[PDB]
Amino acid sequence: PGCGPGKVQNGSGNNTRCCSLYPKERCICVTPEYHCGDPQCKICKHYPCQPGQRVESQGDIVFGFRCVACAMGTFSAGRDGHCRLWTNCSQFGFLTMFPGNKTHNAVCIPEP
Amino acid sequence: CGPGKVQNGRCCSCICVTPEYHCGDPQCKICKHYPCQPGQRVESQGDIVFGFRCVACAMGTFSAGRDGHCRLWTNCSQFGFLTMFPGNKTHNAVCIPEP
Amino acid sequence: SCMVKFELSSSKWHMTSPKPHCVNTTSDGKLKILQSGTYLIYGQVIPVDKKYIKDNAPFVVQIYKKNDVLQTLMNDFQILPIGGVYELHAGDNIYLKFNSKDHIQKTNTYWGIILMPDLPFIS
Amino acid sequence: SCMVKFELSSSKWHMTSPKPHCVNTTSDGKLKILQSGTYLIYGQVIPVDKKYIKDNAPFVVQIYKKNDVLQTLMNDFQILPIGGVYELHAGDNIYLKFNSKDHIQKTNTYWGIILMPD
Numbered sequence: 086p087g088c089g090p091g092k093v094q095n096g097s098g099n100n101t102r103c104c105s106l107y108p109k110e111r112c113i114c115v116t117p118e119y120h121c122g123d124p125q126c127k128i129c130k131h132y133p134c135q136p137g138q139r140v141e142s143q144g145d146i147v148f149g150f151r152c153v154a155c156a157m158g159t160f161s162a163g164r165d166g167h168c169r170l171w172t173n174c175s176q177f178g179f180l181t182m183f184p185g186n187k188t189h190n191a192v193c194i195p196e197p
Numbered sequence: 198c199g200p201g202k203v204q205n206g207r208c209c210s211c212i213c214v215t216p217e218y219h220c221g222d223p224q225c226k227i228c229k230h231y232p233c234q235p236g237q238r239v240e241s242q243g244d245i246v247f248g249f250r251c252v253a254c255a256m257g258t259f260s261a262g263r264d265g266h267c268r269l270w271t272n273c274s275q276f277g278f279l280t281m282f283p284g285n286k287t288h289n290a291v292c293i294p295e296p
Numbered sequence: 297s298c299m300v301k302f303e304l305s306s307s308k309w310h311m312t313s314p315k316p317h318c319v320n321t322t323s324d325g326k327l328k329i330l331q332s333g334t335y336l337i338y339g340q341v342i343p344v345d346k347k348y349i350k351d352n353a354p355f356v357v358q359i360y361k362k363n364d365v366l367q368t369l370m371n372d373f374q375i376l377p378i379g380g381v382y383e384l385h386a387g388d389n390i391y392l393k394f395n396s397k398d399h400i401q402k403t404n405t406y407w408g409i410i411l412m413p414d415l416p417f418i419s
Numbered sequence: 420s421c422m423v424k425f426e427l428s429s430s431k432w433h434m435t436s437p438k439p440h441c442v443n444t445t446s447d448g449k450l451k452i453l454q455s456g457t458y459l460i461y462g463q464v465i466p467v468d469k470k471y472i473k474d475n476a477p478f479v480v481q482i483y484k485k486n487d488v489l490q491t492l493m494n495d496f497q498i499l500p501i502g503g504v505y506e507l508h509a510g511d512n513i514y515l516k517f518n519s520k521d522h523i524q525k526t527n528t529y530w531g532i533i534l535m536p537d
């Protein structure tokens with residue numbers, strides 16, 4: 086039940102919403118404010134972690150949770166609790182109108 | 198009787214004397230905290246360490262604060278007065294004299 | 297080898313001899329230490345499922361000596377092992393006290409003591 | 420008789436015989452059952468005071484058989500007794516697993532096992 090705050094674990098051996106291999110097997114708790122509370126994602130706990138910080142797990146049997154700010158180069162605009170990387174504008178041939186901060190993504194603009 | 202004090206036999210005669218605080222022991226060894234919104238009442242459910250509830254005041258009783266123990270209504274007819282307001286479970290009866 | 301085991305499912309003891317030389321057991325689940333030394337209190341308190349609780353009382357289990365609170369145990373209605381190593385004197389009364397009898401399940405619930413040998417050799 | 424006690428503050432066992440016929444003891448507080456039969460695990464895990472904990476993690480303790488969780492224990496950082504009557508067989512590994520080693524107070528934290536008579 087590693088992807089159910091209202092569901093079961095439905096292994097994402099195709100992109101729907103669940104565990105998928107890469108750690109070797111890797112389960113993600115799919116609902117916002119919910120991250121796994123187990124080294125095996127056996128259960129999904131709830132932790133808000135207001136935008137700008139990620140969730141830190143501090144358990145080896147049952148997980149405890151913290152809210153630590155996103156590192157340089159990552160962002161988080163919602164209460165999910167996992168920071169994502171900035172969109173690299175130069176990869177697609179775009180230009181940074183706004184490089185991005187710890188709560189908002191980068192703004193890419195094309196070449197005029 | 199101490200949420201900030203000791204037992205000073207305001208004390209046993211035990212009642213936890215501070216609002217929102219009622220005893221958490223069959224011997225009142227410690228005083229825990231429980232709000233219980235006005236109109237409700239604190240129910241104890243422990244024989245060793247107390248659990249707290251909030252049960253509403255039965256009709257005829259009232260509680261207009263966060264204490265957690267319902268007080269009886271003020272009977273105006275017992276004093277020869279008339280009831281300007283009979284009262285609900287969150288306010289007391291208001292009596293006025295007779296002209 | 298003085299060891300006793302009380303089964304709360306049937307309210308009956310499991311002893312090594314018809315009468316232990318170290319304790320005198322009672323039918324309700326209490327003990328009276330008759331010999332000074334070291335003993336090992338043990339046992340598991342199986343609480344009733346948390347959804348069967350109507351009186352929302354803490355699941356507090358306490359082991360008592362004559363009048364001194366030996367230990368206080370509480371958790372959110374999970375498997376609750378009790379006991380430990382404790383030096384005891386002759387005449388001490390050993391009995392349990394609970395927060396609400398509605399929490400203790402009869403099945404798989406047991407507790408007792410064992411007379412402790414001395415453990416000289418250390419590794 | 421056959422009984423052991425592991426003092427965590429000294430990492431030394433207290434045994435009834437230097438060569439017990441029931442268990443093989445290790446220096447890290449683990450046990451290998453040598454004789455099959457009824458056993459009794461025991462011990463008390465004393466956590467350091469909650470006012471000293473930094474990592475906000477649940478105080479969880481697990482007693483492990485070979486690879487099976489005999490029991491999972493947790494409370495609000497209080498004196499945690501462990502154990503129970505379990506039917507063990509020869510070749511079983513017995514060891515404990517803590518949620519975080521910072522939570523455990525070494526002084527007066529012990530555990531062991533004892534062979535069961537009838």
Ligand SMILES: *[C@@H]1O[C@H](CO[C@@H]2O[C@@H](C)[C@@H](O)[C@@H](O)[C@@H]2O)[C@@H](O[C@@H]2O[C@H](CO)[C@@H](O)[C@H](O)[C@H]2NC(C)=O)[C@H](O)[C@H]1NC(C)=O
Binds near residue numbers: 183186188189192
């Ligand atoms: C993080 O950045 C936001 C947004 O920056 C502005 O808007 C971006 C989309 C981009 O256009 C930048 O060049 C701008 O400087 C900061 O401000 C928020 O901006 C949004 C508009 O999207 C507005 O709705 C909010 O009210 C603004 N919030 C605040 C508090 O000002 C925000 O301050 C930055 N945060 C940090 C920690 O640097």
Ligand SMILES: *[C@@H]1O[C@H](CO[C@@H]2O[C@@H](C)[C@@H](O)[C@@H](O)[C@@H]2O)[C@@H](O)[C@H](O)[C@H]1NC(C)=O
Binds near residue numbers: 282285286287288
């Ligand atoms: C309960 O009574 C409350 C009190 O009403 C106000 O104060 C009382 C003393 C009178 O002066 C009255 O004229 C005022 O309106 C109400 O506010 C509340 O709505 C009542 N609730 C219920 C459920 O009856």
